[PDB]
Amino acid sequence: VKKLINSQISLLIGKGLHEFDSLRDPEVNDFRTKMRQFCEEAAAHRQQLGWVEWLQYSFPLQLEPNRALLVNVKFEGSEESFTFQVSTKDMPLALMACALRKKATVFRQQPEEYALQVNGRHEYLYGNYPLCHFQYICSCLHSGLTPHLTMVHSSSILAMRDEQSNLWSLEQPFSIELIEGRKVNAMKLVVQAGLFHGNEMLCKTVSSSEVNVCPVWKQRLEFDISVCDLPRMARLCFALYAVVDCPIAWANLMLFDYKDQLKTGERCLYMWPSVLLNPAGTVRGNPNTESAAALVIYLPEVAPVYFPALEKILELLREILERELYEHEKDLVWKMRHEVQEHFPEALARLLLVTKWNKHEDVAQMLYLLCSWPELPVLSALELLDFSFPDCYVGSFAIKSLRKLTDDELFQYLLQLVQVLKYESYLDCELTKFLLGRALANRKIGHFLFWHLRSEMHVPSVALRFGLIMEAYCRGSTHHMKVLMKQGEALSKLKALNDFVKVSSQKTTKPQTKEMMHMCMRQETYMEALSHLQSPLDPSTLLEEVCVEQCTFMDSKMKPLWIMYSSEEAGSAGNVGIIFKNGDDLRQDMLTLQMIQLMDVLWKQEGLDLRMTPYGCLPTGDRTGLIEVVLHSDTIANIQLNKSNMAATAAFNKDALLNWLKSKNPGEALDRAIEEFTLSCAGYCVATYVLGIGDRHSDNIMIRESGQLFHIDFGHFLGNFRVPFILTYDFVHVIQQGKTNNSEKFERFRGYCERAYTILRRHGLLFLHLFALMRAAGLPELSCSKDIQYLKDSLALGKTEEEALKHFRVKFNEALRESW
Ligand SMILES: Cn1nc(-c2cnc(N)c(-n3cc(C(N)=O)cn3)n2)nc1C1(c2ccccc2)CC1
Structure with missing residues (x-):
């Protein structure tokens, strides 16, 4: 009973629980006992939540940061469905009312007792939000597909919750x-x-x-x-x-x-x-x-000496600089520490760095101010997590201020907060208790906390800490532990399959390797391990039946696997793919894609939708991870290959891109594609320039049949081979609608680049604080200040908005001159 759980945790976390005991470390044993109680108490609080609050834990809302649409609705225990013409401005409740009314007319006789499930997904539509504020609905509006929902009653959700239960004297x-x-x-x-x-x-x-x-x-x-x-x-x-x-x-x-x-x-x-x-x-x-x-x-004995309790600690030109400072300036800030607290609370970080940490008196003075210091904004609290602020009381204060983070903001910065665990001095810390408590209150936070920790278990400096956190997580979530084991079993089978493909690709032809990859997959153990799991890329995506015939591998060095899935219940939204990659480190690609995703969040919060493709990338193990397949897409190189008998037959190389778009978007659909191409091109032009992504060629740039442009293979960033802005003739030609001269379309494009850039510049400190926390990762390209400096120059933070936009035009026009 308890024995099987322990052996399930050992297999799942990748380390035997016996190894923790063999250490005979009271620090380890105390972490394990305290955290188990903490995590078990978090599990208890969960079983007594309301059914909507339980939905908020297990299925958190995937929201977006007037016009009609068709929506298909059905009830749980029936195949009979109804299609309605609802408005995007309508809330789920109104849709639930229509469905109950139409069921009442068909069945010949309260909406607050239901929730709308996304068919064949671990996603629900509920809360006081208009339909166009939901990501699934938005995905169905930009593509044009019909949303398919299932009315789930309160008791059926409550059935889910139930089957998912657990001193100063020493002057020498x-x-x-x-x-x-x-x-x-x-x-x-x-x-x-x-x-x-x-x-x-x-x-x-x-x-x-x-x-x-x-x-x-x-x-x-x-x-x-x-x-x-x-x-x-x-x-x-x-x-x-x-x-x-x-x-x-x-x-x-x-x-x-x-x-x-x-x-x-x-x-x-x-x-x-x-x-x-x-x-x-x-x-x-x-x-x-x-x-x-x-x-x-x-360590010479000085006698038992302990560090004094907080009671003992508590007992014992200024404005022109506050925007790297000399000795006299530091003395000024320290003398004026009371002015800093009262009139400049956000300048705390600058006051913490001037304090003499080698003088117990100076520390206690600072610590007395910190104990009465007002809560800081999330942006300031993120700076305080850096290794540059090691004090435990400072660290505690940073967590206190981060408690106001929404589940969405926490998810956006989760990668950074896991790396900060590497700077920690002791096992029992405030950041761990915070991460664990937030993970046990939100299943999507919990999923990604698990995967960020599990992916580093082969790294000996973090294996003990990461293994201990994962174990404590499992104690507070027995059902999720089983869900994650099912993901680990599939990933283990994909590793063996990829090992075979690597061998077979050196000994025979691709159609032969593919057929035997298929033969290996059709085995019962593989059919069962690879089917019916939650996606490690996105727990709301259900990878149901594996589509063996559609499965393949890529021709690159590590021969990455292309695994396709289908779901009867989901219909079309269940047609999903995953790329299994083994041999390369995916940490940098993940960071790069998270940073682009953040840029897209920031542009959308300003009303700017640059049509970005934020596809999943997740390291799962030692030089192992997953990539979410973007369907109906191809590389620019493949489209430019100009293959015969196809619909994109071009007279000139420049025409291939536009001919491909015209074939996928005929008539009135073409103008929409060109707009998608132009917006996404501006976004990735700015993103790749700001992030310093070089080695850009037609083989690592992709296009969707919708016209959206995106980037793959982020092996190099921050100018590591000062990269210029990049504009390609083939792209400019599509932006200019297949015309040589079109100032109308090109000046609009230049405006999108200008605007996207200035928006990022205002949130320039957010990018800087996040990359500085990422220095703890050990990415060879993000190790020192010279790496951070690249971002400061590309963002021109030590300049005014008018002077920075000029410097951008200097770099933009240089890219346009280099364009043939
Ligand atoms: C049709 N197609 N779609 C994609 C695609 C879609 N979504 C992605 N996310 C993605 N990414 C690739 C990487 C990477 N680093 O390799 C990362 N993402 N690639 N690739 C192909 C091609 C192909 C597939 C399958 C077999 C041979 C060839 C090349 C034609």
Whole structure:
């Protein structure tokens, strides 16, 4: 009973629960007990919610940030359906009233007792919102398809909820005895030590004696800082290197434990391999104790000393700079700390950075202001999550201010908040409790929290923390654990299938590999594992019956799988596809697509719809992930191949794109396609310029039959090969309706580029704060400040709106001149 759950969690999280116990770590055991109770209490609160509130948990509303339409409606236990001519301005309730009235006339005799289910999807339409505010309806309006809904009664939803139940005295300087090492390298060994509070030094780094490569030291290392001046989040950072400089390894550790006790005495530090000091690095040792170089040290006893409780802490030209500052400016800000709190609360981040964290008096003064500091906007609170603000009280304050995040905003920044877990010092933290509580209150948040954590289980520095969080999540969600295992079983089968395809593609022809891929898929174990799951890309998308005949693979290096699905209940909306990719890291593609999706959110919040294609991309495992198939689309290169006997037969290369559009959009449909092409082109022109996406060719640009242009394969961003704006002749030709000269259409296009750009510029700090939190990911192209700088230049944030739009025209006209 409880035994099967534990063995289900182990298989699902990818780590045995026994491994947690084998550690004999009271920090681990205390996380597990406290979080289990927390997560079980979150599960209990859920079983007592109202049926609409339960819908808000399991099926949160997929909303969008007058005119009539046909809508098909049916009731749960019947095939009989009714089609109505409703208005987009109508609310679900009015639609539910019509359906109950038409059922009353047919069946010969209350709308608040029902909810509208999207046929063959894990999506519902409810709440006081007009129909055109729903994403599914909007998808059905832009394409032209008929929405299909099922009237679900309150008791049927309640049946779902039920079958888914579970001190200052120490004035002496800080010192450490550096005992000995046990490493490998070709020279002498120096052990550089240092004390840090986040990204900054609490004193100057102290080095060890040059001991030969053939190691013993037994050397006292004293730091220029008093033991009573040690901030609660003080970090001792070591670096072992070879010299005649060659780095060998690194290790960090917190001076206080999870129970606030200043650590004593002997410690063996299992070092991590080096690429010199790494304060941002994990404060947990290398779990590969058999091959890791170790540093044995001694924490001299000062006697049990604890960090003082909050009661003890609480007991103990300005405007022209507030928009990188000199020593005198820092002193000014500190003296005026009371003015900052009262008249500039949003400048807290700038005041936290000027405070002397190496002086216990200065810290307590700042902490007394923080304890009475007013709640900050989400935008400011996001800056406070950075490794640049390590203090636990500052971290707690950031969470307190982030509690007002809507489930939509939290979902948009979820990727960033999971990376911040990597900067954390202890297992039990406010961010974890926050993430878990929000995940257990929203099944879509929970789904993506799981997948962001599961995708990093093969990374030894996060495996313990991520495995512990996932376990606690499962305790508060036994039914979801089973749903996610079904996803893991399919992904496990797709891995084996892709391994076969890789082998078979080197030994025979594609029609032979495809047929045996099909033969492998038609096996019962594969038919069952690959069918009837929630999509890991989107839990509201149901991947029902696998369409073997339609399944294939791509010709690229890793031979990615093309898996098609169909759903009788969903009709046409159930015709969905997934791309299984194994061999490449999908983290950067995901980040890039999330950033484009954010841009689209921001343009839509300003009334601008640039017709973007925000398709799913999700890393699931070690160099493994999924991509959502965008159907009725092709690469520009494929359309430009000019294949014979087709409807897009072109005399000139320039005509191929427009000829393809004309064949997919005949008559009055053509003008609509050109508008879609132009809007989406402006969006991706701005997005790729702002994000610095280079290596753009006809093979990584796609078009939908609707005319919408989109980008694939984001292997390089932030100018990593200063990329210019890009305008292609083939595109300009389509924008200009197949005419050589058309200033009317081109100046409108230039306006879309101008507008899209200035909108992003106003939210330029949002992009900067999100990319700075993403530095914790370890993406080779987002590792330092020079990566962040690219965004600052492309957005021209250190300029005025009038001066930035001029600089954009300079770059736009350069791209138009390069266009043949
Ligand atoms: C018809 N079609 N549709 C797509 C498509 C649709 N939706 C996407 N999201 C997408 N993405 C590709 C990547 C990537 N990084 O490879 C990412 N997204 N590709 N690709 C094809 C082609 C093709 C399919 C299947 C077999 C051979 C060839 C190439 C004709």
